[PDB]
Amino acid sequence: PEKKWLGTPIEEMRKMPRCGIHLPSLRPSASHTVTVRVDLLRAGEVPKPFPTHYKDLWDNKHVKMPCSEQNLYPTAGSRWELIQTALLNKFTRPQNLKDAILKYNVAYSKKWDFTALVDFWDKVLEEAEAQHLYQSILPDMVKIALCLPNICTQPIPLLKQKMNHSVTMSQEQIASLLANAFFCTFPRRNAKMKSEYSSYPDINFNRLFEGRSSRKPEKLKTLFCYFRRVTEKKPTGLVTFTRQSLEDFPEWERCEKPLTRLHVTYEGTIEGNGRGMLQVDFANRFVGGGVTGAGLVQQEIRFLINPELIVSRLFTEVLDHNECLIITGTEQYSEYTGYAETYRWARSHEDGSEKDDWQRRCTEIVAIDALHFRRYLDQFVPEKVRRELNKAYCGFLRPGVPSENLSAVATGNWGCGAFGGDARLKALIQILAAAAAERDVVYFTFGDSELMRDIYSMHTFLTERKLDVGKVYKLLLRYYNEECRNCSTPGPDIKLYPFIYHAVESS
Ligand SMILES: Nc1ncnc2c1ncn2[C@@H]1O[C@H](COP(=O)(O)O)[C@@H](O)[C@H]1O[C@H]1O[C@H](COP(=O)(O)O)[C@@H](O)[C@H]1O
Secondary structure, eight states: OOOSEEESOGGGSOOTTTTOOOOOOOOOBTTEEEOBOGGGOOTTSOOOBSSSSOOOOOSTTBOOOTTOTTOEEOOOEEHHHHHHHHHSSOOSSHHHHHHHHHHTOGGGTTTOOOHHHHHIIIIISOHHHHHHIIIIIHHHHHHHHHTHHHHOOSOOBOBOTTOOEEEEEEHHHHHHHHHHHHTTOOTTSSOTTOSTTTTSOOOSOGGGGSSSOTHHHHHHHHHHHHHHHHHHSOOOOEEEEEEEEOSOOOOGGGOOOOOOOEEEESSSOHHHHSTTSEEEEEEOSSTTTTTTTTOOSHHHHHHHHSGGGGGHHHHBOOOOTTEEEEEESOOOOEEEESSGGGOEEEEEOOOOOOBOTTSOBSOEEEEEEOOOOSSGGGGGSHHHHHHHHHHHHHHHOOTTSOGGGOOOEEEEOTTBGGGOBOHHHHHHHHHHHHHHTTOOEEEEOTTOHHHHHHHHHHHHHHHHTTOOHHHHHHHHHHHIIIIITTOOSSSOSSOHHHHHHHHHHHO
16 A cells, blocks of 8 residues: 655754754844844743833834824824723623624624624524633733734734835734734725735725625634633733745756755645744735635634734735745644535643744744646646745745745645646746755655656656756656647646656656
8 A cells, every 4th residue: 555655754854943053142133123122031921122212103114003192083083092991891701702892893883794793602502611712802902902012012013025124023913913904904905995905905804794605603612712821821922923025046957056955755744744944824915814714714714723923914914926935933732524515623822842942933924825737738838837946945944044045835736726836846946946946855644545656757767867956847848848838638648746757767
């Protein structure tokens, strides 16, 4: 029978914290916003905010905070005071939460449906679970939500396109912001015809409450698990959000870098078995995809189980082709089973990972968006091969960091299935990109054992015949020109891997 894994033994791959560089002291710079007191940062203690007291910026370079005094509502009065007054009330029934949220969202009183929240509260939860929800969890969420100005004292810059910039933030700060998103308090993030934020993903959680989909109660469970944890016990770690945008990329056709090591397996998960490795989030260019709406596929799932990722939607503009988002220090709060319609919340997860010197859990996630291919052959066009290579490379490269201090890339079938990607091409693309970035690859095929074998066989062949990135890229070009360009059927008669074997063996 087929084996469970092939290639380099996974324990020989590099992983954090062991492989990590010595971190320099944490400090703010022009490229790094730090919202906590670094001199007061201690293990197991909730970080203190810097500055000591709330400072406001209401402009096109920073998040528009709900607690801003320039956040106004019909005389024009303080919307924050109206938020406070509406949410500092007792909820016994789901309509009470709905009505509270709608007091400072009156324009959406008709357009925001709450059927899934009502159903969740009254049909899915048992009586005692609901009491707990409205007697403990919801008041505790309101509490940290209204402390926003005491917790998030420093303005948060928007990570716009082209910026190479980092925001480091406490998990406690993220909790207060995510509580605010739940209660839908973020201004200028709601309208269809919104201008300033149309290039940003949704942050407010309103669409989690709408419609009759069975996906919603599973999403709400997942999120209330998170809110329960961080209100019962305040998290003490930091998380770093980094936008990375590269203008220059390898000259793929002539790249002389050799292929790196591979571990490929049809069992295991990226988040479970890629511990301490760069974990690829198969993202939407709007990071988190439809996580706060109806989406529940590869683009959303990691944002649910590591819900601190969701906060990135507050300040991360849509990714361009040459961009990615790197998140360090998020915690896994939930386990799940299934996918899409079969997604279900299994149980809470106790993340047991170590922390680095900046008190960030040794978990690194990179969101990179593949293209969607609505015509299958489009992805073999060299220009599209290059686009994916460059996207993956941007996700993997760490300017300034020696390669020996880089963990393996933990990845899988990026943008395949219903998104249109070919698994075997995308595997080879990620292998080539990892080679250029001088990282090893741990590839999870999620049940597909023939694919595990085919990937390994190809990697072994190319490695043994000493084909560098450029030679392999040249074979991709030959495959395009000889089999794809003039192909009048949806797929070509000869496949990619068989073409490569034959071309090398004929040559
Ligand atoms: N994230 C940060 N951003 C900016 N400054 C910071 C940060 N973290 C610490 N500091 C500052 O770096 C200093 C430690 O520097 P050393 O490790 O080299 O010794 C800290 O004192 C911090 O100074 C400021 O925070 C204080 C706020 O106090 P009140 O305004 O409520 O009175 C105040 O002193 C102010 O100047």
